[PDB]
Amino acid sequence: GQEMYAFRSEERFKSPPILPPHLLQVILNKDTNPNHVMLNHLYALSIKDSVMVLSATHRYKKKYVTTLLYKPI
Amino acid sequence: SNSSVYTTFMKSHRCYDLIPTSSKLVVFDTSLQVKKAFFALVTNGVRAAPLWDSKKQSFVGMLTITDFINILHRYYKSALVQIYELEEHKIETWREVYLQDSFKPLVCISPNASLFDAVSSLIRNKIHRLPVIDPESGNTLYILTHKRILKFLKLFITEFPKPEFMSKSLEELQIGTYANIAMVRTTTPVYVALGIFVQHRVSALPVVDEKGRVVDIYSKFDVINLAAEKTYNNLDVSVTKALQHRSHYFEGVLKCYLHETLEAIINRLVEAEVHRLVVVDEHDVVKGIVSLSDILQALVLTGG
Amino acid sequence: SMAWHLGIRSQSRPNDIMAEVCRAIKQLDYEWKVVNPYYLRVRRKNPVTSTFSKMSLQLYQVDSRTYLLDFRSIDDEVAPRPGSHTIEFFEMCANLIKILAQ
Ligand SMILES: Nc1ncnc2c1ncn2[C@@H]1O[C@H](COP(=O)(O)OP(=O)(O)OP(=O)(O)O)[C@@H](O)[C@H]1O
Numbered sequence: 001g002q003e004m005y006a007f008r009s010e011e012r013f014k015s016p017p018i019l020p021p022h023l024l025q026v027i028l029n030k031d032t033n034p035n036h037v038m039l040n041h042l043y044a045l046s047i048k049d050s051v052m053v054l055s056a057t058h059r060y061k062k063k064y065v066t067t068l069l070y071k072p073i
Numbered sequence: 074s075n076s077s078v079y080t081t082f083m084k085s086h087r088c089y090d091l092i093p094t095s096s097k098l099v100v101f102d103t104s105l106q107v108k109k110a111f112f113a114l115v116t117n118g119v120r121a122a123p124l125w126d127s128k129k130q131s132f133v134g135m136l137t138i139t140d141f142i143n144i145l146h147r148y149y150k151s152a153l154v155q156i157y158e159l160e161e162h163k164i165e166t167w168r169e170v171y172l173q174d175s176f177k178p179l180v181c182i183s184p185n186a187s188l189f190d191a192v193s194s195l196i197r198n199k200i201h202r203l204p205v206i207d208p209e210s211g212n213t214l215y216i217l218t219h220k221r222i223l224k225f226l227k228l229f230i231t232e233f234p235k236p237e238f239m240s241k242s243l244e245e246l247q248i249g250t251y252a253n254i255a256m257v258r259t260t261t262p263v264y265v266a267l268g269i270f271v272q273h274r275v276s277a278l279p280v281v282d283e284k285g286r287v288v289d290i291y292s293k294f295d296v297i298n299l300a301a302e303k304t305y306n307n308l309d310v311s312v313t314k315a316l317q318h319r320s321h322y323f324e325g326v327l328k329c330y331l332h333e334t335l336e337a338i339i340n341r342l343v344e345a346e347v348h349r350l351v352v353v354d355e356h357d358v359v360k361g362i363v364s365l366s367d368i369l370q371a372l373v374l375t376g377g
Numbered sequence: 378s379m380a381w382h383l384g385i386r387s388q389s390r391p392n393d394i395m396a397e398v399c400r401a402i403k404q405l406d407y408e409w410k411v412v413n414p415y416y417l418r419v420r421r422k423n424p425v426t427s428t429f430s431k432m433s434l435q436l437y438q439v440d441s442r443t444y445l446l447d448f449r450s451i452d453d454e455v456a457p458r459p460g461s462h463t464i465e466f467f468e469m470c471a472n473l474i475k476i477l478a479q
């Protein structure tokens with residue numbers, strides 16, 4: 001009959017994938033106040049005074065809005 | 074003139090057509106402290122923010138400079154009587170404090186609705202901020218204003234098979250307000266100015282000298298500047314001193330005469346990117362105001 | 378609105394991160410599927426509106442010691458009242474973060 005043996009993938013999913021193909025870890029929007037695949041991704045400011053600021057850019061037809069939600073914790 | 078190139082253009086364009094390729098939108102949860110919310114407006118360089126009720130899971134209203142004005146006036150009078158509730162109010166709690174039985178539900182417009190419908194809704198509801206909300210998503214896409222609408226009209230009608238009414242004066246068309254003009258003087262304290270805003274429901278006050286000549290303009294826009302300060306105690310200062318906090322060279326107040334054509338007024342307003350002109354006589358004495366509201370109301374009821 | 382950070386970062390073990398997010402998802406009554414050991418698809422029924430919202434979670438390595446949890450909303454397929462896909466996405470992320478992190 002003989003016992004059968006298992007060769008197991010291992011690795012690939014040892015360690016999470018590295019971040020940047022083109023996805024930016026930090027966005028600076030000082031500006032004295034055209035990017036690809038950051039659409040639909042959650043962005044945030046550092047928490048301040050028990051308030052979260054969550055943000056994302058979404059597309060409606062050919063228009064893009066960056067929405068910010070200020071939300072107590 | 075009548076039936077208008079304007080009326081037809083407005084009926085044949087969707088609200089979507091005026092949304093910029095890219096914009097930002099600030100939304101507040103109604104549990105947010107009022108004080109933090111108004112500071113966020115300044116921070117983000119934004120008038121108007123839709124309000125989201127998390128329990129109800131819906132947009133319930135807008136937060137504007139007017140709301141800030143109502144709150145400060147209330148705060149200022151309450152403090153003199155040692156009541157300090159207001160500035161620890163959440164958006165929710167202030168809303169129930171004034172939206173009592175008095176019901177003002179959120180007014181919005183679909184991206185697929187006509188620009189005519191937008192203009193009518195703004196006028197009918199006596200409002201300056203019309204959120205464009207996608208019915209399929211429930212997402213607010215943009216907040217539509219009179220300024221944006223007029224600019225769009227100026228630009229995309231800018232051909233002229235021209236209505237006869239465009240060559241007629243504000244005088245003959247009777248566009249503008251020419252009585253009971255709410256104004257202040259150089260020395261008028263900010264809290265007095267607040268009271269006037271609260272009573273008259275008016276977006277700006279001409280600042281006049283001893284002879285009633287206009288020398289400056291105190292807008293509600295200039296009022297959220299106070300949300301940047303940490304004390305709110307500087308409401309006793311004059312309108313003049315409060316206006317020092319402006320960004321830019323203040324070239325002067327943008328004026329017009331009663332005898333200028335609607336065309337010239339529309340052109341000046343769109344290029345200046347301001348909400349109103351102060352109507353003035355030969356000698357700078359204020360005779361009235363012509364606002365973006367006045368113009369859009371005229372264009373929708375067919376010019377003048 | 379000056380310095381914006383993608384998702385949230387952690388120096389916790391990647392296995393601990395994923396395991397804890399999965400426990401949060403289940404505690405929150407969301408449904409999920411494991412696409413990869415570091416990539417989850419989640420689906421939530423709005424207990425008020427009865428609508429369904431989907432999002433993706435992806436863990437990344439940003440340092441030798443640091444990981445980034447990334448949240449991405451998945452696009453579906455007069456007065457408004459109930460629902461906004463975008464706001465609901467934020468609340469989903471917020472609920473998930475609160476219920477599994479720090
Ligand atoms: N789309 C809307 N639906 C319901 N209520 C609104 C809407 N927009 C504004 N309001 C409310 O109406 C009142 C005045 O709003 P308005 O938009 O005129 O204020 P504003 O933006 O300060 O205008 P302005 O500075 O031009 O006077 C506020 O109490 C505000 O919350």
Ligand SMILES: Nc1ncnc2c1ncn2[C@@H]1O[C@H](COP(=O)(O)OP(=O)(O)OP(=O)(O)O)[C@@H](O)[C@H]1O
Pocket residue numbers: 120201218219220276277290291292293294295319325326327328346347348349350351365
């Ligand atoms: N007639 C005028 N002359 C000179 N400056 C003006 C005039 N009207 C407004 N301003 C200034 O322009 C700035 C913008 O004010 P405005 O009243 O247009 O508010 P806004 O938010 O830009 O307009 P809107 O409410 O239509 O979007 C303010 O600082 C105000 O003092």
Ligand SMILES: Nc1ncnc2c1ncn2[C@@H]1O[C@H](COP(=O)(O)O)[C@@H](O)[C@H]1O
Pocket residue numbers: 249250252253254255256274275276277278279348349362363364365366367
């Ligand atoms: N200071 C003011 N005094 C009296 N009426 C005004 C004043 N400012 C604006 N109005 C009028 O009020 C209406 C709404 O204007 P606005 O507040 O500018 O949107 C318009 O008919 C304006 O002409």
